[PDB]
A paper describes a structure:
FadD32 is one of the 34 FadD proteins of M. tuberculosis annotated as putative fatty acyl-CoA synthetases, and its role in mycolic acid biosynthesis is to activate C48–C64 meromycolic acid for condensation by PKS1313. FadD32 belongs to the adenylating enzyme superfamily that includes acyl-CoA synthetases, the adenylation domains of nonribosomal peptide synthetases, and firefly luciferases. These enzymes consist of two domains and catalyze two half-reactions: an adenylate-forming reaction which leads to formation of acyl-AMP from a carboxylate substrate and ATP, and a thioester-forming reaction which leads to formation of acyl-CoA from acyl-AMP and CoA or formation of acyl-ACP from acyl-AMP and ACP15. Although FadD32 was initially found to catalyze only the first half-reaction and was named fatty acyl-AMP ligase (FAAL), later evidence demonstrated that it is a bifunctional enzyme: during mycolic acid biosynthesis FadD32 catalyzes both the formation of meromycoloyl-AMP from meromycolic acid and ATP and the subsequent acyl chain transfer from meromycoloyl-AMP to the phosphopantetheinyl arm of the N-terminal ACP domain of PKS131617.
Although N-MsFadD32 could be easily crystallized, we could only obtain crystals of full-length MsFadD32 by co-crystallizing the SUMO fusion protein and ATP. We observed one molecule of MsFadD32 and one molecule of SUMO in the asymmetric unit of the crystal structure of ATP-bound MsFadD32, with a critical crystal contact mediated by SUMO. The overall structure of MsFadD32 consists of two distinct domains, a large N-terminal domain comprising residues 1–483 and a smaller C-terminal domain comprising residues 484–630. Structural comparisons with other adenylating enzymes reveal that ATP-bound MsFadD32 exists in the adenylate-forming conformation. However, the invariant Lys601 in motif A10 located in the C-terminal domain does not point into the active site and interact with ATP but forms a charge-stabilized hydrogen bond with Glu315 located in the N-terminal subdomain B. In the MsFadD32-ATP complex, ATP sits in a cleft at the interface between the N- and C-terminal domains, and the residues involved in ATP binding are all from the large N-terminal domain. The three phosphate groups of ATP are held in place mainly by the P-loop27 residues (Thr187–Arg192 of motif A3). The Mg2+ ion, which bridges the β- and γ-phosphates, is coordinated by two oxygen atoms from the β- and γ-phosphates and four water molecules. There is a hydrophobic tunnel in the ATP-bound MsFadD32 structure at the opposite side of the phosphate tail of ATP. Phe284 is located at the entrance of the putative pantetheine-binding tunnel of MsFadD32.
Author numbering:
A (entry chain B): 21 to 94
B (entry chain A): 1 to 630
Amino acid sequence: ETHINLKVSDGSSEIFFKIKKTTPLRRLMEAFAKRQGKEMDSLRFLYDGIRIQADQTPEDLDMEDNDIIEAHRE
Amino acid sequence: MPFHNPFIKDGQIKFPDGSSIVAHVERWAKVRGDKLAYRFLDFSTERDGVPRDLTWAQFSARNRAVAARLQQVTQPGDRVAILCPQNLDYLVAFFGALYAGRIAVPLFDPSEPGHVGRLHAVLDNCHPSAILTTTEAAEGVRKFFRTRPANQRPRVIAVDAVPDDVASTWVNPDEPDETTIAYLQYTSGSTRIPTGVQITHLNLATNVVQVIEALEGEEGDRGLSWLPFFHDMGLITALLAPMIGHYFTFMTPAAFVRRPERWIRELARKEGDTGGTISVAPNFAFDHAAARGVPKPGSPPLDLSNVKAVLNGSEPISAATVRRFNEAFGPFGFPPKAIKPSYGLAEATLFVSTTPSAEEPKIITVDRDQLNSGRIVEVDADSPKAVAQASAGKVGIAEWAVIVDAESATELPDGQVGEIWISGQNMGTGYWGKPEESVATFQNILKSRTNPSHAEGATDDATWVRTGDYGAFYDGDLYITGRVKDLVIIDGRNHYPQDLEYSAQEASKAIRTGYVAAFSVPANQLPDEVFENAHSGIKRDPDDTSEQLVIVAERAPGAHKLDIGPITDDIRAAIAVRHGVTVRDVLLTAAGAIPRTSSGKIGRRACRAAYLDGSLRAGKVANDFPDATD
Ligand SMILES: Nc1ncnc2c1ncn2[C@@H]1O[C@H](COP(=O)(O)OP(=O)(O)OP(=O)(O)O)[C@@H](O)[C@H]1O
Ligand SMILES: [Mg+2]
């Protein structure tokens, strides 16, 4: 399959997404950004504690279905 | 009340089910979870340090969490490289890999200076599927892997960001068999590119028991180290705790270098001590502490009469080092018997031999002529024939070392020099990614023994490891005379390089000990300067392949520049007069020119290769290791 489900969480709001493995995480990040009323660069996104860049894709990061992205400030 | 080793029954090492180091940690977590297991002395902010502690239950929780994550993103048999800075998370990362049933590869934070060549070499050999680091080190790790090919940038995990609750899905791997590899112990790369010894769970547990036996270690004996975990001695000392039951305390090497009294103060008696401190130290640790670690006048009292053992290895112990350390710390009650010279190497996990607890370091002087001819004979220290040899003591339990004529695989009588071969359940199962070298190095049969034999107790079909060292048994003790690959053989005569290097530094002010290397090359591979020099004593011949002596040395940084002429003359005469060999070329380089090892010692085959290529000549950066064809 070409899609995976990704779950983003900032300690409270646990929002689920679906995305193609080849699609940059930018749109997903900005989507999560404003449902929390914050803007994208007000947030850092971590995958296994490692910072994600907006133009990186799930495929670049070897993400699997139902992985977790943790969202912090700064 | 004499010493009893709990892991030994009738002179044999007995391991019931659940004897791997993972099972032992889990056991401690169950029966005494709040007991202190590991302490990191953090000197990054506070000059006097901040202890960071982990109980067995806390240690276990972190290990299982990392292990659970690892089991989600790696396969059985995958290697997992530890690129953490030296702190508690390094151990969590290392044990996490073990807990996961993966092969740990203990390395270091790439932000560390000077070690990048080793890092590439290891990664090109074992190809890890995952990198463990910390959030603090993550950026430096990312930057490092930008210097690797795009298909050589495995996934990175910061172990301090892995949540505890991840551990709920951890699966305890099956009981390991004697083939189950726990981690790779890379060699120092003294004679070659660092090679990865395959250490099994059985290897590891066995050698821990052997170290406990050798040191007569008790649960009240606090463990202490500043050594890197990617060094042979650095790792095993940190792995005694789950079996011996002490707690282990460590600091960074940089912390030790900056203030060696920190190590001295931790060695010292603490109130509540019910045992003696166990630590580990290359010659440098003793030298540096003696020169920079003695408490200033008026300092708080220092009591070192509690110290049980400081294991000394990776090298022969120096008599001067022993004198200076005891002069410096003897007044504070330091027991001379606490210095434990030992023989060890990656192929044996670590430990092979050390002194009995009653004894002090033994350094003898032997006859140069007899030594060069393969025999050990003592002479007076003031004899012009005197060569120093350091005792490595007695071979450990369930372990064997024999001196051997390699070609015929036959044991030599005591006092005669040959290859050291070793056998035991602590011996690794091969070199990673090098199946032929593995067979040649690890699978040797001992065809003939003496009476009595140092192989006594070993089965006749036992497999033997070629250490790559020359040595001998003399008057009850093991001596290592030198490395097989480094032996200088010229005009049908043997010369030990360190012996030649010592004459060279003694001959000239511009030649410093530890900054000079002696090796030979075929005559026709000598540079043109040699054949054009009158004083060399050799002229060009394309068919002359006879081995010729070369000396390479570094000048001090600064104090540029003095004539190489009288320096070469002094070295050539001195070596010819004492050794009866004539150096064909003396090459001086700038500081840091000569390739070195993990420890910081010159790698002679690598110096030789860089002489011949010829980097050192024109001032190019020299390759830290020799080609695989050397
Ligand atoms: N007491 C000792 N006296 C003399 N040499 C020692 C002593 N203890 C250790 N050594 C040297 O250190 C070696 C063990 O070092 P290690 O296993 O870290 O790799 P290395 O042999 O230095 O490097 P490589 O195997 O890649 O050439 C021993 O084989 C021996 O040469
Ligand atoms: Mg070796």
